[PDB]
């Protein structure tokens, strides 16, 4: 297909070794574009040899379609991706797998396991 990519309020942030910006995707008369296509388009535009170093979030399709706004981060490398990004975002990217989903039952267990009441 065909669409247009637009980068707004772009700024490089070496402190997080990131590059922050806002995405506007013009896809008139056609449905919202999957994140893979915008990933490769951004890779071509910014001359990146690898595609797992970006993260995309906050994608909204607006009213009436033909437009989508979102936020993207360009990372120096995958090591920076893992260092400076949260676990849920890494799981979204698929870079890692889900951890244990016990939740507040861990807190319940910790309350049960009063010190010197469980010798182990």
């Amino acid at each position: 297909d065909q669409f247009t990519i637009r980068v707004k309020k772009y700024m490089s942030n070496p402190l997080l070794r990131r590059k922050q910006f806002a995405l506007e995707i013009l896809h008139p008369n056609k449905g919202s574009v999957a994140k893979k296509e915008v990933k490769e388009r951004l890779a071509k535009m910014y001359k990146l040899n690898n595609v797992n170093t970006i993260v995309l979030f906050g994608f909204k399709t607006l009213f009436g379609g033909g437009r989508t706004k979102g936020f993207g981060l360009i990372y120096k490398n995958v090591d920076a991706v893992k260092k400076f990004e949260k676990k849920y975002r890494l799981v979204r990217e698929g870079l890692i797998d889900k951890e244990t989903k016990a939740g507040r039952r861990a807190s319940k267990e910790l309350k049960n396991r009063r010190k010197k009441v469980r010798g182990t």
Binding site: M11, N13, P14, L15, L16, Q20, F84, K86
Partner: protein, 257 residues
């Protein structure tokens, strides 16, 4: 018990922090340090809400863990550290130097400064205390104690301070020609030349300050900061140059674009 409160509600936070109502229920209570909470911003909001470098408090912590940002050429790692009225903030990874200043609308802005200027901070002496041995110490607005100040320095003077050595370089008086910057009033952020000083016995002393365009505004004596002499400000200023404009004619220059 009824000890010290340790939370700040968002709407109870200082107005110049510019925190939005719906962005959570709490504001970052600045740690105790060089400056008052009311007359300072925590560097978390300095580089999350102003510089937009960080998007979340955790990203602020991410920045701070690496000993990058230095407040007065020394490394700060506390997330809620009060940066204060005027001083230098050096970010080494991006190699940028900021001076914290006030805009004409009474808000804290990081103003770009050169590396050469990032060594010349200004401190407003608030007290002169003589300790044992007739040794004199100047207590400044920075909460900083400078021992062995020059005996000519008075209680409302200002002193240029070298960040590397922590020494005074020169001092600035408060005559009727010394230009000052107002810090906390209706006229917070204005830069003027001091038209007159009225000293009321036992109450606040008032000073009338003349602007560049010859408009006069009065303020309390404790709310001013000597910046330079009549020749020039000793520090650089933001783009407005401390010149406040009537709202009826700010609109015209906003419209013309």
């Amino acid at each position: 018990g009824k000890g010290i409160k340790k939370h700040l509600k968002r709407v109870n936070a200082p107005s110049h922090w510019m925190l939005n109502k719906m962005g959570g229920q709490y504001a970052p209570k600045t740690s105790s340090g060089p400056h008052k909470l009311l007359e300072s911003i925590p560097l978390v909001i300095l580089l999350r809400n102003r510089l937009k470098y960080a998007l979340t408090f955790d990203e602020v912590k991410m920045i701070l863990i690496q000993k990058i940002v230095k407040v007065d050429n020394k490394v700060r790692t506390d997330c809620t550290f009060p940066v204060g009225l005027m001083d230098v903030i050096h970010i080494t990874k991006s190699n940028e130097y900021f001076r914290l200043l006030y805009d004409i609308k009474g808000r804290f802005v990081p103003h770009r400064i050169t590396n050469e200027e990032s060594k010349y901070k200004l401190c407003k002496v608030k007290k002169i205390l003589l300790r044992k041995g007739r040794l004199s110490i100047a207590v400044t607005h920075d909460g900083r104690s400078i021992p062995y100040i020059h005996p000519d320095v008075k209680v409302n003077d200002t002193v240029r301070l070298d960040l590397e050595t922590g020494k005074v370089l020169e001092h600035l008086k408060f005559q009727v020609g010394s230009l000052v910057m107002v810090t906390a009033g209706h006229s917070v952020g204005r830069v003027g030349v001091i038209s007159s000083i009225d000293k009321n016995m036992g109450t606040y002393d008032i000073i009338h300050v003349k602007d560049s365009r010859n408009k006069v505004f009065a303020t309390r004596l404790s709310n001013v900061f000597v910046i330079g002499d009549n020749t020039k400000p000793y520090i650089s200023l933001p783009r407005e140059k401390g010149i406040k404009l009537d709202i009826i004619e700010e609109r015209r220059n906003r419209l013309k674009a």
